[PDB]
Symmetry: C3
Subunit: 92 residues, 3 copies
């Protein structure tokens, strides 16, 4: 499982979340950050969908002008859902 | 060393903190974040983050579960990632001396 | 590629950022965070938060030790609560505008 992070311009949040949702990725976390105003988006997905999710972020946030932001990919060792205690892939 | 992250409901913060502290885990970092749910959409959440030695992970995870679980949708999730190095600014202690 | 993260006292941010520029690191991401009366969604709560700032930078492996060194020297006051730095691997970095990776 992977954690996909994206730092994007605030006005793209709505489009980003819509394109993610169209490939089935929900469960986003959003934080307001300052880039030296941006929005950070974090989503922990199954390895089987990282390519689709990265591409849907690039599809929606790419305006084309300077400052569209970056995306970062990192491994996640384990994911636990609190309510049930399900672990790994079925915790997504 | 492992970073333990959890995204929990806001008002479960105090309990989680106290339950961690019972298992010896302090040094929490707290960030206010949004999650997505008339059905409300934009929701308050709180992200907690702590870096622990490898052997403490299981009981750190155990303690967060005990304190936050209600058995309803919205209780949140925990993730655990690897950290390559930890440095304590004040002294320069690295690794397990730094946790 | 490494993600360097530091959690520092809030009045040290300009100084840290100046130190980092001297070793060539400039694109910082800054988050306001808390450690252990305040208002929350309109109601007063008695709490014992301390405000901190998280700084995050993603750099080339070769640059880490000089980034780390630059933060330590600028952020230290010598007091308790100075904070901590940690390093993580980043599997892939994509620039949105272009597709550079």
């Amino acid at each position: 499982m992977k954690q996909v992070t994206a730092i994007i311009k605030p006005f793209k949040l709505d489009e980003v979340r819509e394109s993610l949702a169209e490939v089935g990725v929900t469960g986003l976390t959003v934080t307001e950050v300052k880039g030296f105003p941006k929005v950070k988006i974090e989503v922990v997905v199954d390895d089987k969908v990282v390519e689709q999710a990265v591409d849907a972020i690039i599809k929606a946030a790419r305006t084309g002008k300077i400052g569209d932001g970056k995306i970062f990919v990192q491994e996640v060792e384990q994911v636990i859902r609190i309510r049930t205690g399900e672990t790994g892939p079925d915790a997504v």
